[PDB]
């Protein structure tokens, strides 16, 4: 897993999370919206947001990066000892969602990227090594439910 040290680093980096949750959760959405369009589609509520500004503009949009953001900061907490929050946020995914593992690998992909623009020069190499090993820790604990359950 993880060792003490970059535990320590994943929740230094989430404290620069939490001072902003719900700016930091918009722009991961924006993120994953915009650069994979098809996942706009998974979410019935905000298939109506035509344009990036029409996405800026949603207090929606930002209410459920802050319902995202918080869920995950709840997981990385648990620092590996996750399954009870993990089990189910992996269950509803698969099997009421339907989101794919490779939406997750885009969603992680996008926390490194807004990580990076809302804090450049602040986000340095180690803390990206130890953000990067919690989210791929994140993912590969939710591709073993949905294995369990022949998801994708
Ligand atoms: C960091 C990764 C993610 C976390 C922590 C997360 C967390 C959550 C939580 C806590 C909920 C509300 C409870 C639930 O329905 O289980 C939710 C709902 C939902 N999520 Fe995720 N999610 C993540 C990634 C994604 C991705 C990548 C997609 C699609 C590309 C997605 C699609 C949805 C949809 C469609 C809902 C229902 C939204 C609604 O209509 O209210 N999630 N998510």
């Known amino acids: 897993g993880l060792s003490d040290g970059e535990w320590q680093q994943v929740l230094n980096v989430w404290g620069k999370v939490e001072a902003d949750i719900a700016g930091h959760g918009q722009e991961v959405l924006i993120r994953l919206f915009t650069g994979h369009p098809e996942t706009l589609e998974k979410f019935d509520k905000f298939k109506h947001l035509k ?4 996405m800026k503009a949603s207090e929606d949009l930002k209410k459920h990066g802050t319902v995202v953001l918080t869920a995950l900061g709840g997981i990385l907490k648990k620092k590996g000892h996750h399954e009870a929050e993990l089990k189910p946020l992996a269950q509803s995914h698969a099997t009421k969602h339907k989101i794919p593992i490779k939406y997750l690998e885009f969603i992680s992909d996008a926390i490194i990227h807004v990580l990076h623009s809302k804090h450049p020069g602040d986000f340095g ?3 990206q090594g130890a953000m990067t090993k919690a989210l ?3 993912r590969n604990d939710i ?3 949905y ?3 022949g998801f994708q």
């Open 143 to 145: 591709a073993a439910k």
């Open 136 to 138: 791929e820790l994140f």
């Open 125 to 127: 190499a180690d803390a």
């Open 51 to 54: 344009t990036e500004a029409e």
């Open 147 to 149: 294995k369990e359950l």
